[PDB]
Amino acid sequence: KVFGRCELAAAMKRHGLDNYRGYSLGNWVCAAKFESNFNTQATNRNTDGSTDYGILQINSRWWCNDGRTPGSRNLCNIPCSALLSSDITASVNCAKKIVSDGNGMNAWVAWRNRCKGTDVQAWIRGCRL
Ligand SMILES: CC(=O)N[C@@H]1[C@@H](O)[C@H](O[C@@H]2O[C@H](CO)[C@@H](O[C@@H]3O[C@H](CO)[C@@H](O)[C@H](O)[C@H]3NC(C)=O)[C@H](O)[C@H]2NC(C)=O)[C@@H](CO)O[C@H]1O
């Protein structure tokens, strides 16, 4: 599923991401935009052999099991495929654990390079929330 900007904002809000660990909604929408272009089925392979999955590009070396990332952890206790669903619940639940792990949203490279320190409120402009 390719979400519309406001449509994703509403689903994230519904799932309790607005101000989760002090990160306003605009931060999450900005991260999704640059990580996957709002496509739940996005996948990208990394040089270490791990793969990033879904709307939030969650990595198989640490958070999910894809059966092909030797000696990786599965901190969210889920198969990576669960993260590609049209329903963002699994991705959001796993995102909450990631952001709480010590580095905040710096765990998302695109957030750190294209969202951090910008006017993120712009990502929720005109949305009915
Ligand atoms: C969205 C996503 O999947 N992002 C990936 C990053 O999570 C990953 O960064 C590494 O993540 C782990 C797990 O959070 C970091 O380990 C944690 O580090 C802090 C101290 O910095 C410590 O308090 C935690 O105990 C420790 N957690 C665990 C479970 O050991 C680790 O520091 C991150 N590594 C780097 C270089 O930033 C990166 C890199 O694998 O991939 C992203 O895709």
Residue of minimum CA distance from atom 34 in ligand 1: 107
Q: Which residues are catalytic?
A: 35, 52
**Closest C-alpha among 50, 128, 45, 52 to residue 94:** 52
The number of folded domains in the chain is 1
Q: Is the dihedral of CA 1, 37, 104, 127 positive or negative?
A: negative
Cα(107) to ligand 1 centroid in Å equals 6
Residue of minimum CA distance from atom 36 in ligand 1: 107
Q: Give the residue numbers spanning the domain of 15.
A: 1-129
Question: Known binder of ligand: residue 18?
Answer: no
Closest ligand 1 atom to 106 CA = 37
The experimental technique behind this entry is: X-ray
Cα(35) to ligand 1 centroid in Å equals 17
**Closest C-alpha among 30, 42, 56, 36 to residue 120:** 30
CATH of the domain at 87: 1.10.530.10
Phi, psi angle pair for 50, to nearest 5° = -80, 170
- Cβ of 4: how many Cβ atoms within 10 Å? 10
Distance CA 68, CA 95 (A): 21
